[PDB]
């Protein structure tokens, strides 16, 4: 197992994904600074398209609390509904 | 494990979430008053968007019975349907 | 575990819910009469919105056979479809 | 466990349900003739609304092969789609 | 257990179904030729309506590779979508 | 078990499929060059229709990172929505 191989599943909730990411990051043999930079880069890069969209909408400077609270809607009825309606409107 | 990390999954039923929340709260090392305040704040803050919407509509002064009885519709056929129709109407 | 904490899940089939309800009710320390009254009140009170709608439509005087046979449609394709269409008609 | 309590789940496939029905029926203490009559009556009576609709369309005189082969469409994409479209047409 | 009772589930993927079919066929006491004929007849006869539709569209002379590669779309988003749209067009 | 029998499930995420593909590929008795060629041909050939569509759109010269990052949208709300809308537009 490597930190680079941690990718969020398409139907995986964000909290689970970040949990696996941090579990694995606590194991990789690397300096703390490298672990922080890893956090900032990988954590956002390896999310699925929906969560990556929301986080891209948040911009920079957001904490984990803000991100996770922003993403726990994905897959919920309201999210699926809004996304579907927006998709039908686009096409 | 910490009480602050208990967040309701997007597809998780409310009863399960409150079950984990109270199971964990009985373990966190803190005074009884701090545990009650934790209940009031976290329990509502850490729910997913749908349940948070319904509970915000209930307002304050509601008991666990009133909240849970208010939220067990989420994910049910009627709930998903109503949410979908309202979403199509919005866009 | 207490009989008052037995609540039907949003996606839980009715037969399962009544199975848990009676399994738990056979354990609660209470007189037989109190257990019957418990049955009549809780069993209907703690169901989810869809089943509560159907049972409310049945009215009083219905047996468990009539109720369960009335509710095993919930979640089935026909049920979800009919409910969805009615929801679209409402909005 | 009793044969009268075997009911098909709303999302349960037919083959599984008949499997439970025959497994439990093989245990009930009763004469063989009573077990056959049980088969004919309960097996059709305790199915969910969709399968009961299809089997009601088949009528009497059908064997298990004809029924099961008639019902394995339930829940499949084609079934859910057709049912949904017919429901939209009704309303 | 008998080869005649192997039926594809409504939501079962084709690869799994053929896996059970061949696993069981390796157990049934019968000559190799009878097992081949069993393959040709049962394997296609006992599939669910969607897979039976696609395979019927393929016609005869197709190998297992062609069939399985033809059916792995069933249940996928694209399949369910196409089937749903065709269903709405039909009604 | 043989590498030729590794096929992506209809609802299986791509990362899982490639994980099984490489897990099995590390076991098949063959020279390394044959294993690379196996990778290039089978890995893309045995995917389901959606992933095969996206990867076919990518063309040649793409690495595993580009493919996997391209496919983790499959099954996500946005993907299913876009596919559904495009399907309704086609018909």
Numbering used by the authors:
A (entry chain K), B (entry chain J), C (entry chain I), D (entry chain H), E (entry chain G), F (entry chain L): 148 to 238
Passage from the reporting paper:
To learn how the CA-SP1 junction functions as a molecular switch during HIV-1 assembly and maturation, we determined the structure of its immature, assembled form by X-ray crystallography at a resolution of 3.27 Å. The CTD-SP1 plate crystals were made up of stacked sheets of flat hexagonal lattices, with each sheet consisting of CTD-SP1 hexamers connected by CTD dimer linkages. Our structure therefore represents a flattened version of the immature HIV-1 Gag lattice. In our crystal structure, each subunit contains the main CTD fold (amino acids 281–351 in the HIV-1 Gag numbering scheme) and the CA-SP1 switch region (residues 352–370). The switch region immediately follows the main CTD fold, and consists of two parts: a type II β-turn (residues 352–355) and an α-helix that spans the CA-SP1 junction (residues 356–370). The CTD-SP1 hexamer looks like a goblet, with the main CTD fold forming the cup and the CA-SP1 junction forming the stem. Underneath the cup, the junction helices form a 6-helix bundle as predicted. Therefore, for PR to gain access to its substrate, the 6-helix bundle must unfold. Our structure revealed a second structural component of the CA-SP1 switch, which consists of five amino acid residues that connect the main fold of the CTD and the junction helix (352GVGGP356). This motif makes a right-handed type II β-turn that buries the Val353 sidechain within a shallow sub-pocket at the bottom of the CTD, which is made of the MHR and 9/10 loops.
Assembly and maturation of HIV-1 and other retroviruses is driven by the viral structural polyprotein, Gag, which consists of a series of independently folding domains, called MA (matrix), CA (capsid), and NC (nucleocapsid). The Gag shell has hexagonal paracrystalline lattice symmetry, wherein the central CA region makes two layers of interactions through its two domains (NTD and CTD, for N-terminal and C-terminal domain). A second putative switch spans the junction between CA and the first spacer peptide (SP1). In summary, our studies reveal the molecular details of a bipartite HIV-1 CA-SP1 switch with critical functions in both virus particle assembly and proteolytic maturation.
